[PDB]
């Protein structure tokens, strides 16, 4: 994708993440765990449902039209009826092909984006207390129990609390 | 039974924007296209591992 997260610096997806689209996996002094990220999963989901509802919105209603099958050769007028219809179908067929091509490119890039956006938010909370290991994982340079990880996941992590401990571990 | 969209082959659902059943139609109908399938992504890239 354009952002290089999904199928990029995140080396692969997690078949085991079954209650969210994006999330966290951790290891600390109390063990390891997993949690869906609620906001991003929902951010991705709403856009895809939004686009989809736009796509499946409002078919046209048509009633009396033209004949499109003919049991006799008639020439000029039939040629024209068949040409108009054939033309209409090729145009719509083109529109249909183009619409899904564009949507899918956009669906893929927006999902890559949410991953990248989630990743960036995590980095920002952590300030100087962690480093990006480059594979979508952060190394946290302080003791960080389950409540601490959860504090990161729920967006209330207070970087200042751990900064002295962390900087000491990073640089000394 | 109940259906807004009717073709000479029979009624069809009109929940999808396109159809490949028949260029002849009556009612609130998807638009006829030549393709017999068109997939709209509704998820991210799938990258399974090992």
């Amino acid at each position, epitope marked *: 994708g354009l952002f290089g997260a999904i199928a990029g610096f995140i080396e692969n997806g*997690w078949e085991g993440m*079954i*209650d969210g689209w994006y999330g966290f996996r951790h290891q600390n002094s109390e063990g*390891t765990g*997993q949690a869906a990220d*609620l906001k991003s999963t929902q951010a991705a989901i709403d856009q895809i449902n939004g686009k989809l509802n736009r796509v499946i919105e409002k078919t046209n209603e048509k009633f009396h039209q033209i004949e499109k099958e003919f049991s006799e050769v008639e020439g000029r007028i039939q040629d024209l009826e068949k040409y108009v219809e054939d033309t209409k179908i090729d145009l719509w067929s083109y529109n249909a092909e183009l619409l899904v091509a564009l949507e899918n490119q956009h669906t893929i890039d927006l999902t890559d984006s949410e991953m990248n956006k989630l990743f960036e938010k995590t980095g920002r909370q952590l300030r100087e207390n962690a480093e990006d290991m480059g594979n979508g994982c952060f190394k946290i340079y302080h003791k960080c129990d389950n409540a601490c990880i959860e504090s990161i996941r729920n967006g209330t992590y207070d970087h200042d609390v751990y900064r002295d401990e962390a900087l000491n571990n990073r640089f000394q | 039974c109940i259906s807004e969209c009717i073709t000479p082959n029979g009624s069809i659902p009109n929940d999808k924007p396109f159809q490949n059943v028949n260029k002849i139609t009556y009612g609130a109908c998807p638009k006829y296209v030549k393709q017999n399938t068109l997939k709209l992504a509704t998820g991210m890239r799938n990258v399974p591992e090992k």
Partner: antibody
Framework: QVQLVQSGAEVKKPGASVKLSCKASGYTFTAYSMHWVRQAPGQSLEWLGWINTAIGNTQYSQKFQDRVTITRDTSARTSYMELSSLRSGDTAVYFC??????????????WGKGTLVTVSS | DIQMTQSPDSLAVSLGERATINCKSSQSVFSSSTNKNYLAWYQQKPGQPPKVLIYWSSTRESGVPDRFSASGSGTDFTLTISSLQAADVAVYYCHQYYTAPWTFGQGTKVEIKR
């Protein structure tokens, strides 16, 4: 083709130990949790515990933390459940089952055919 | 732990008729966090291992016929077999996976009424 091949039937006497195996194939092994659930005859299903297949950490049901240990061999694609100090009340079918997700917060979509273990003197 | 308790213990229904099994969990298995119910339903025929029919309390496993459906939220759940066929005669289990330990219901044996 997801498959779970469990060890053959086992008969053991009280106070002894047993170790069952579960051999997986058809899916990436370290991406799904493994669970061990038993069933006494004519009874309900009883979860014994689970193992995180990547890391290898476990947790067991408290009625079993004393005696059950769950293991995995990542190159073997295989799980192992070992029960000690067996009693007649441990006579049951022992299923291994793949979690729908590792971390155990997920149902089971694939169960092994079961291993009967009988405990009597 | 979270106790799963099914009702009724045994249920007899006529062929083609409707079958309805109920499940209550000792604590809620809904996560406001993920907006999902962590609940599953399994079928078990004698000798055979359990088979998921339904997960997320209301999602049907693939390949499972559409006559099975489940619903409910939080602590109240309901499995339904809309039009009972002979192969549906089995034991059904509900299953919470909201938290370890996994617990299951006691099981509802379902038979053909005649």
């Amino acid at each position: 083709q997801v498959q779970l091949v469990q060890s053959g039937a086992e008969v053991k006497k009280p106070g002894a130990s047993v170790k069952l195996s579960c051999k997986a194939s058809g899916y990436t092994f370290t991406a799904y949790s493994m669970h061990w659930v038993r069933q006494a005859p004519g009874q309900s299903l009883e979860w014994l515990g689970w193992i995180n297949t990547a890391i290898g950490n476990t947790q067991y049901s408290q009625k079993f933390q004393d005696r059950v240990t769950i293991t995995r061999d990542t190159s073997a694609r295989t799980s192992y459940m070992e029960l000690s100090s067996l009693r007649s009340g441990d006579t049951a079918v022992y299923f291994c089952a793949r979690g729908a997700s590792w971390d155990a917060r997920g149902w089971s979509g694939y169960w092994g055919k079961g291993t009967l273990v009988t405990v009597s003197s | 732990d979270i106790q799963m308790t099914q009702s009724p213990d045994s249920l007899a229904v006529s062929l083609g008729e409707r079958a309805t099994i109920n499940c209550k969990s000792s604590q809620s298995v809904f996560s406001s966090s993920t907006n999902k119910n962590y609940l599953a339903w399994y079928q078990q025929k004698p000798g055979q291992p359990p088979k998921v029919l339904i997960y997320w309390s209301s999602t049907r496993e693939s390949g499972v016929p559409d006559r099975f459906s489940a619903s409910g939220s939080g602590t109240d759940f309901t499995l339904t077999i809309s039009s009972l066929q002979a192969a549906d005669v089995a034991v059904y289990y509900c299953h919470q996976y909201y938290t370890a330990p996994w617990t299951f219901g006691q099981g509802t044996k379902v038979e053909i009424k005649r």
